[PDB]
């Protein structure tokens, strides 16, 4: 468990490790936005 002073951020930290996955998804939003140039 996180130190008590950071307990407020528990639900943010449970989601943080998926963020690198989201950068992969993001390259495909970008390329749909330019028409897969």
């Amino acid at each position: 468990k996180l130190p008590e002073a950071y307990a407020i951020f528990d639900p943010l930290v449970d989601v943080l490790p998926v963020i690198p996955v989201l950068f992969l998804a993001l390259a495909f939003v970008w390329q749909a936005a330019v028409g897969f140039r």
Binding site: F23, W30, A33, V34
Partner: peptide, 27 residues
């Protein structure tokens, strides 16, 4: 809710594409 934060986080990326394309920048 953990469904709350991963929404504000997941919307960030597409918002960057959106703002840049309706301001017509180097995409």
């Amino acid at each position: 809710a953990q469904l709350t934060m991963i929404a504000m986080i997941g919307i960030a990326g597409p918002m960057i594409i959106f703002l840049l394309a309706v301001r017509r920048g180097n995409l």
